[PDB]
Amino acid sequence: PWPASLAALALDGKLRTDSNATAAASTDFGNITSALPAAVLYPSSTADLVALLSAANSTPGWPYTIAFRGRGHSLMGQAFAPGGVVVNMASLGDAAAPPRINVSADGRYVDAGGEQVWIDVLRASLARGVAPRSWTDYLYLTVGGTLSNAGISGQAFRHGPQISNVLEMDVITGHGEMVTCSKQLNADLFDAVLGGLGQFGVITRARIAVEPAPARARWVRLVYTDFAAFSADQERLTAPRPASFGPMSYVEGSVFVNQSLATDLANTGFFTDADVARIVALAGERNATTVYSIEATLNYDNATAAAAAVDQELASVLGTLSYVEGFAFQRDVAYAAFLDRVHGSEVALNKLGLWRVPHPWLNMFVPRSRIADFDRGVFKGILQGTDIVGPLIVYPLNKSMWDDGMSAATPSEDVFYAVSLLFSSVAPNDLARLQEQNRRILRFCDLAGIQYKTYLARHTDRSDWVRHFGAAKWNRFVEMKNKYDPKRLLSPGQDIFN
Ligand SMILES: *Cc1cc2c(cc1C)nc1c(=O)[nH]c(=O)nc-1n2C[C@H](O)[C@H](O)[C@H](O)COP(=O)(O)OP(=O)(O)OC[C@H]1O[C@@H](n2cnc3c(N)ncnc32)[C@H](O)[C@@H]1O
Ligand SMILES: CC(C)=CCNc1ncnc2c1ncn2[C@@H]1O[C@H](CO)[C@@H](O)[C@H]1O
Ligand SMILES: *[C@@H]1O[C@H](CO)[C@@H](O)[C@H](O)[C@H]1NC(C)=O
Ligand SMILES: *[C@@H]1O[C@H](CO)[C@@H](O)[C@H](O)[C@H]1NC(C)=O
Numbered sequence: 182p183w184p185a186s187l188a189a190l191a192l193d194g195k196l197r198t199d200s201n202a203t204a205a206a207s208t209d210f211g212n213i214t215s216a217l218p219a220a221v222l223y224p225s226s227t228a229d230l231v232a233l234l235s236a237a238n239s240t241p242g243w244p245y246t247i248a249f250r251g252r253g254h255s256l257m258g259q260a261f262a263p264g265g266v267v268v269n270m271a272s273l274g275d276a277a278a279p280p281r282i283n284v285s286a287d288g289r290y291v292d293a294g295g296e297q298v299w300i301d302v303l304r305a306s307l308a309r310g311v312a313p314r315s316w317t318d319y320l321y322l323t324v325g326g327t328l329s330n331a332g333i334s335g336q337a338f339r340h341g342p343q344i345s346n347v348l349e350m351d352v353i354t355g356h357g358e359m360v361t362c363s364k365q366l367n368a369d370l371f372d373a374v375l376g377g378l379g380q381f382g383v384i385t386r387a388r389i390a391v392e393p394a395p396a397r398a399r400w401v402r403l404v405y406t407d408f409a410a411f412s413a414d415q416e417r418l419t420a421p422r423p424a425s426f427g428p429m430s431y432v433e434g435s436v437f438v439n440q441s442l443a444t445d446l447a448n449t450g451f452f453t454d455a456d457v458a459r460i461v462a463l464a465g466e467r468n469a470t471t472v473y474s475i476e477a478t479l480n481y482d483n484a485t486a487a488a489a490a491v492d493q494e495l496a497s498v499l500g501t502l503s504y505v506e507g508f509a510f511q512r513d514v515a516y517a518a519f520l521d522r523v524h525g526s527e528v529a530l531n532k533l534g535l536w537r538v539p540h541p542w543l544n545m546f547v548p549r550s551r552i553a554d555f556d557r558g559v560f561k562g563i564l565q566g567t568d569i570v571g572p573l574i575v576y577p578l579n580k581s582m583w584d585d586g587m588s589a590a591t592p593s594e595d596v597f598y599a600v601s602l603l604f605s606s607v608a609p610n611d612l613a614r615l616q617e618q619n620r621r622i623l624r625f626c627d628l629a630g631i632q633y634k635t636y637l638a639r640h641t642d643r644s645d646w647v648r649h650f651g652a653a654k655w656n657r658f659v660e661m662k663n664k665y666d667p668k669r670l671l672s673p674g675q676d677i678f679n
C-alpha cells in the first residue's frame with residue numbers, strides 16, 4: 182500500500198519505470214560497472230523528494246534503495262540504486278521560475294540548488310561580479326555531488342576544498358524531514374553530509390562562499406626533470422606564511438612519462454610545438470625517464486596597471502623557484518576561460534569517441550613524507566614501459582584548511598598530495614591491464630607502509646571502509662547513519678552499509 186503523496190508522483194508521471202528511464206540511470210562516467218534501478222524519480226520541486234523519503238521511512242518493510250543522480254560522473258556505480266529508485270536530481274531545475282541560483286544582496290555568498298552544475302553557478306555569480314573561491318578542475322558536476330565527496334582543484338591549498346566553503350545547507354534526511362543546517366544549527370548533520378558520500382540525506386540547497394570576481398588569470402607552466410626540485414617548489418608556492426598564503430591563486434602539477442612525452446605535452450593544450458621540441462630535447466640531455474610541470478595562476482582585475490603589476494609579482498615569485506633555467510611558459514586568459522579549460526577536452530574526446538570509454542581512474546591523497554617514495558615506485562617504476570592515455574596530476578594540499586570533523590577522510594600529515602592518475606581505456610585488454618595496474622599501485626603503497634586515503638573510490642569490504650575513515654571517525658559515521666538513514670536506503674552504490 183502506497184501513501185497518497187507517493188501515489189501522486191506516479192500519477193503525475195514523475196515516477197517512471199520504462200526501459201528508457203531505467204537505462205539512463207544504470208550507467209556512469211566510469212563506464213565499468215552497471216546496475217538497473219526498479220524506478221527513476223524526476224522531481225519538479227523539493228516537496229516531491231519529501232514525499233519519496235517520508236514514504237520510505239513510514240512504509241514498513243520498504244525494499245527500495247534511493248540514489249541521487251547529479252550528473253553521474255561517479256567512476257564505480259556510486260550513483261546507482263540496484264533494483265531501487267534513482268532520483269534524477271537535474272529535474273529540480275526544470276522550471277525557469279523560481280531561479281535555482283541566487284547571489285546574496287550583500288554579494289558575500291551564492292545560494293545554489295543541490296542539483297545545479299558548477300558551470301551555471303559560475304555564470305550566475307559572474308553576472309553579480311562575484312565567484313566561488315574553491316573549484317573542481319571540470320565544471321560540469323553538481324553542487325551536491327562534489328559536496329558529498331570534497332571538491333578539489335588548484336585553489337584548495339589556500340581556501341580548502343569545496344566542503345570548507347559552505348555556510349549552510351538544506352538537507353532532506355532519510356526520515357523525509359527538510360532540515361536547514363550549519364556550524365550553529367544542526368551541526369552534526371552539516372558535518373556528516375559534507376564528504377558524506379550521499380549517506381545521510383539529499384542536499385537541496387548549499388550556501389557557497391564567494392569572493393569579488395577577478396577578470397583575468399596569468400597562467401604559467403614551469404618544467405623540471407628533478408622530482409625533488411618539482412615537489413620542493415610546489416610546497417614553497419603553497420606554504421602558509423607567518424592562515425595566510427603566498428601570491429599564487431592556483432597550484433597544480435603534471436607528471437609526464439618519457440615514452441609518450443611529446444604526445445602528452447602537445448595534448449596539454451598549453452604548449453606550442455616549439456615548446457614541446459625544447460622539453461623533449463631537455464629530457465634527452467638529462468636522460469630523464471619522467472618530466473614534471475608545475476601549473477600555476479595569478480588572478481588579477483581589469484585595472485590599467487594590473488598587467489604591469491602582475492609581471493613584477495610573477496617575476497618576484499619565479500625568482501624564488503628552481504625550474505630548469507628558461508623553462509617558464511606563460512599564457513594570459515579571462516578567468517571564466519581558465520575555469521572552464523577542461524570542457525574543451527570533453528568536446529574533443531567525445532567527437533573522437535574517447536570520452537564515453539572506461540575510466541579506471543586512480544585518485545588518492547598521499548602524505549608529503551612519502552611522496553618521493555611514491556614517485557620512485559610509481560612514476561619511475563610501475564608506469565614505465567606502459568602506453569599512458571590521460572593526464573597524471575600531482576599537487577600538495579594543506580591539512581589546516583580541511584575540517585576533520587566533516588565526513589571526508591584525509592592523511593594525518595600537515596601536507597598531503599592529491600594524486601590523480603586519469604587513465605582512459607583503449608581496448609578490453611587495456612581495461613583489465615589498467616585495473617590490475619591500479620591494484621599493483623595500491624599493493625606497492627600498502628607494502629611500503631604509505632598511509633594514503635583514496636578519493637572518489639568505493640570500497641567493497643567493511644574492513645576497508647573502517648580503515649578509510651579511521652576507527653574513531655567510523656564510529657561517528659555509523660552514529661550519524663543511524664540518526665539520518667536508519668533504514669540504510671541512501672546511496673547504496675558506495676557499498677558502505679549496502
Ligand atoms: C567525471 C569527472 C569527475 C570529476 C572530475 C572530472 C570529470 C571529467 N574532476 C574533479 C576535480 O577536479 N575535483 C574533484 O573533487 N572531483 C572531480 N570529479 C569527481 C566528482 O566530484 C564526482 O564524480 C562526484 O560524484 C560529483 O559528480 P556528480 O555531481 O555527477 O554526482 P554523482 O556521481 O551523480 O553522485 C555522487 C554520489 O553523491 C550522491 N549525491 C549526488 N548529488 C547529491 C545531492 N544533491 N545530495 C546528496 N547526495 C548527492 C549520489 O547519490 C552518489 O552517491
Ligand atoms: C581529482 C580529479 C578527478 C581531477 C580530474 N580533472 C580532470 N579530469 C579530466 N581531465 C582533466 C582534468 N584536469 C585536467 N584535465 C585535462 O588534462 C590536461 C591538463 O594537462 C588538459 O587536457 C586538461 O583539459
Ligand atoms: C560503456 O559505454 C559503451 C559505449 O557508450 C556502452 O556500449 C556500454 O554499455 C557501457 N558499459 C557500462 C558498463 O556502462
Ligand atoms: C625516451 O623515449 C624514447 C622513445 O620514445 C627513447 O628513444 C629514449 O631512449 C627514452 N629515454 C629514456 C631516458 O628512457
Ligand SMILES: *[C@@H]1O[C@H](CO)[C@@H](O)[C@H](O)[C@H]1NC(C)=O
Pocket residue numbers: 468470
Ligand atoms: C640513462 O638512464 C637509463 C634509465 O634510467 C639507465 O639505463 C642508464 O644507466 C642511463 N645512462 C647514463 C649514461 O647515465
